[PDB]
Amino acid sequence: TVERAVKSVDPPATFKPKDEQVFYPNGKPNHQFLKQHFIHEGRLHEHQAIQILKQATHLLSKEPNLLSVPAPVTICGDVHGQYYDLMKLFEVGGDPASTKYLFLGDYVDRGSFSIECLLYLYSLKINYPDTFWMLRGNHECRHLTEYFTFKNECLHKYSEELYEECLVSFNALPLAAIMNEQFFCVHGGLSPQLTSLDSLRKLHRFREPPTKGLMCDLLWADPIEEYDDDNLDQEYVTNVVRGCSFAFTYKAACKFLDRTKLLSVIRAHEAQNAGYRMYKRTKTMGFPSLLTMFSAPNYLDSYNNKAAVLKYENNVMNIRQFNASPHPYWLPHFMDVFTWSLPFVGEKVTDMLVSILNVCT
Amino acid sequence: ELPQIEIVQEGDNTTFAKPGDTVTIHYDGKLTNGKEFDSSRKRGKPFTCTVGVGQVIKGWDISLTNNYGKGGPKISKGTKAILTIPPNLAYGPRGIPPIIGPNETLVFEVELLGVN
Amino acid sequence: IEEIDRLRKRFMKLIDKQEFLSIPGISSNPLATRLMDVFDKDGDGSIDFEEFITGLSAFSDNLNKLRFAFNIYDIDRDGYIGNGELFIVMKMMVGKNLKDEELQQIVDKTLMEADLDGDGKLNFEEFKNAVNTDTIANTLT
Ligand SMILES: C=CC[C@@H]1/C=C(\C)C[C@H](C)C[C@H](OC)[C@H]2O[C@@](O)(C(=O)C(=O)N3CCCC[C@H]3C(=O)O[C@H](/C(C)=C/[C@@H]3CC[C@@H](O)[C@H](OC)C3)[C@H](C)[C@@H](O)CC1=O)[C@H](C)C[C@@H]2OC
Ligand SMILES: [Ca+2]
Ligand SMILES: [Ca+2]
Ligand SMILES: [Ca+2]
Ligand SMILES: [Fe+3]
Ligand SMILES: [Zn+2]
């Protein structure tokens, strides 16, 4: 009655840790604390979470549109707030204290632990700003977080002020990276306006992504479904599936790689049953022209897909896969049980109160 | 007023649910703008109910029991369907906040996994 | 006073726990026992004519409507909604649609959001803060 009916279930940690636990004496977030605290569904004081958002925004806003990421590095695809799979990812990819990381975006939406994923990743960024890097994906913007789950999540767990602060940090995320002077890394893919790498360097990126143009395409582009068949002469085609942007062909990737003297394109953005996918090999050097990474296993609790990260070194692409891990339950829209049950309580009670009333003519 | 039923894939054409039966369904629900509000498949537990008795919204009873035998498209076991349900046959002007707003039309993508 | 005499003949045509389920539709209602108990204000197992009128009278200010909704969850009538009480009453309505681990986890997070003073249960004040005071009184009519 006052004890817990299901004692094998761990209870959530506190929604109010002290400042001395969330931050190291130097004022940077204590990521080892936040890792365990978020595993147990603990929350922060709002001012603590805003502090982490503001320090990450400050670091990110100083980086260029197009990062330079040296090898060895672990490259990761989508997370989508699947915080308990993110814990496994770090196990597979290496300890951030001695492993370089490059995330390709889509940290938020769909999973019920987006703000934990985002605050945790940012606390790594802040503590390891020279070895830990994060690109923007197409979900790191106002339009999609409004349409999917992340805004409802911030409003439920924190406030709209925090939601606005996250948007500021999304607009500051870099768009792409050159990894080891060999790979173009981006969330979506190529663009008809990606004439040179300078086209990307000249963009004003601190904004919501446009309806169309370079910045939209980097976040939204896919390869054509028949990309490996290589039976199209065009470089770019209208992406009906996404309802914006373009799908690009093997010919577009090869001309781009030749122009920029690069080996391959590494991106994410599309779910993969195997966690990754290597596409048709380059006629110039033999490397895969394209690689898709996807780091969200059992996507949406229903795909039963593996996830993968890429551990790149010595000109070797070590693909490391992992399966899904269990996570706690949330109602849709982060409803509490009173919000969830009270409409039904009222229906069921009223029904009885009307039968009791209608017993007499 | 009736709900719109569009048959995506068909089942056995033999096993039709009748009022008072139970069914088992995997459904994804979304609004006409595409925003999803719920999915049984994500929750891992197929929905089970008794159809035709008012234990669900009226659109579901009408869809699953063929308007109690008075159509105007039947659904058989193994059919994957799409039910477009008008607000008066769902949650009306009140809605179920904060998950369903007012005067909302609901689109359910249902797969009838079992009957009884 | 004319309606107060009206409930006397409804009550007389109808209370024991066996008599109560006889009412049409109450037999299959998942909140049948919870509603019985709330009307059963002295916990003796049957509903008085004074409890009948008094409990109906909340369906008055909006405060009696909030008090009734609270009492559906407060099983032992102690004035707090305990973690286990919340699980038990939810289990009456949720059926096999959630696993017990799932139900306990969202029961836990609900109370941790609504529990201001830190004791792990919800008094009437914290319950009123956590719900829509208006949505509740409107439903009851
Ligand atoms: C203890 C919790 C309450 C209890 C909750 C469950 C057993 C869990 C169960 C999987 C519901 C889901 O919870 C994850 C969730 O399913 C939805 O997302 C949904 O897809 C939906 O529309 N469905 C469910 C599938 C059949 C049709 C319809 C429905 O008929 O649902 C019914 C419904 C809401 C009827 C209302 C009741 C209130 C009246 O005012 C209204 O009168 C017009 C009619 C459901 C089955 C109720 O009988 C039972 C409950 O409410 C709703 C959008 C909101 C709903 O959560 C509440
Ligand atoms: Ca009594
Ligand atoms: Ca109690
Ligand atoms: Ca309390
Ligand atoms: Fe994605
Ligand atoms: Zn994407």
Author numbering:
A (entry chain A): 62 to 422
B (entry chain C): 4 to 75, 79 to 122
C (entry chain B): 19 to 32, 40 to 84, 88 to 169
Lines quoted from the article behind this entry:
Calcineurin (CN) is a Ca2+/calmodulin (CaM)-dependent, serine, threonine-specific protein phosphatase that controls T-cell activation and is critical for numerous cellular functions. Here we report the crystal structures of fungal CN ternary complexes with FKBP12-FK506 from highly clinically relevant human fungal pathogens: A. fumigatus, C. albicans, C. neoformans, and Coccidioides immitis, reflecting the common invasive fungal pathogens, including a mold, yeasts, and a dimorphic endemic fungus.
Despite sequence variations between the mammalian and fungal counterparts of CN and FKBP12, the X-ray characterized ternary complexes reveal high structural homology. A flexible hinge in CnA separates the catalytic domain from the BBH, which forms the composite surface for FKBP12-FK506-complex binding. Fungal CnB structures are also conserved, with two well-resolved C-terminal EF-hands close to the FKBP12-FK506 binding surface and the two distal N-terminal EF-hands showing varying degrees of disorder, suggesting interaction with FKBP12-FK506 may stabilize the C-terminal EF-hands. While the CnA and CnB interacting residues within 5–8 Å of FK506 in human and fungi are conserved, fungal FKBP12s differed in 4 of the 17 interacting residues, as well as other residues surrounding the 40s and 80s loops.
